Specification:
The structure is a homohexamer. Chain A is of the alpha+beta class. Chain A has a single domain (1-63), classed as OB fold (Dihydrolipoamide Acetyltransferase, E2P). Helices cover 14% and strands 29% of the residues of chain A. Chain A contains 1 helix and 4 strands; from the N terminus they run ββββα. A 3-stranded antiparallel beta sheet of chain A has the order 2-3-4, with no helix packed on it. The radius of gyration of chain A is 12 Å and the shape is globular. At the A-B interface, strand 1 and strand 4 of A face strand 1 and strand 4 of B. Chains B, C, D, E: The modification Methionine sulfoxide is found at residue 63. Chains B, C, D, E: Disulfide bonds join 6-30, 7-46. Chains B, C, D, E: Glycans are attached at residue 1. Chains B, C, D, E: It comes from Homo sapiens (Human).
Chain lengths: 63, 64, 64, 64, 64, 64
């Protein structure tokens, strides 16, 4: 019964890697697939899970 | 935040009126139309725009 | 402020007329032409100018 | 729903660092990618992500 | 005042003629030519001096 | 500012009485010339040179 966050557009220019703290996937019932990066000071940017630079960010955050 | 709050399910019963603090309509690009009530403890509850009890909650919110 | 407000979608069902306080057209630099209604507590809603009820609202929230 | 703030140009001369309080990126729907700085007394300035001085300003605040 | 009002974009869809009451030209030192229509409740719209419907409006406004 | 953007083409010659200065803002980025605009207690907009010293400490005092 609660609201769920969705993304409807992606940023083009890659975010500074050193600024990123966390990440998570948007819900599956959302109209569009998306990854949300969270910077050290609570900035949230909708990224595209299909592009390459987005994946290697995710791999870096967990290895 | 780039993210936009959306709804996929409406609240079953009514909500205590003394608890509601603010309201707003859902996004246009959201798949389903929705009313979101905000409360004293900063939570967001989805409600059906068609049902009666949601309407006068917005209405009496709107006048005094 | 340097930023300018734009709309990328529209509300589906009409809004209670008595709640409407003001209206304005969005800037021409925006991709999608839109009307923005403002309720008595500054809740803003994106509407579609080609629709009918949107126009009739604009005609009457303007005259007298 | 709500209007989304966009930028269509950028300030040429850098802002005083001591005056800036917050930053954020504009939404992806916008035609022009932009940084938005916010001062201590709530002014908003559209900055250019590609040009250098804008980047250290973001780097300095985020890493502090 | 010392500032000078300017326009950097035009609206596409023509305004309802009955809503207009006044008009004026932007200054020549501005980058772009522009007329500004003023509605009954002080809404301002930038228009394009080269398009037909703009001149027909100005004509009807002058045959008062 | 949804419809026209205020721009400057000339700067004021002698400094402004500080006790008359209420608020400031920078001009838009598509304006041909960069400028600082002071707003006074009687709601008049005054253009000032962003390079000249007295204009800067006025802003700095305003923002501290």
């Amino acid at each position: 019964s609660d609201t769920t966050p969705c993304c409807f557009a992606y940023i083009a220019r890659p975010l500074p890697r050193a600024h990123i703290k966390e990440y998570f996937y948007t819900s599956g019932k959302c109209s569009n697939p998306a990854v949300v990066f969270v910077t050290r000071k609570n900035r949230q940017v909708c990224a595209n899970p299909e592009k390459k630079w987005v994946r290697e960010y995710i791999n870096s955050l967990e290895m």
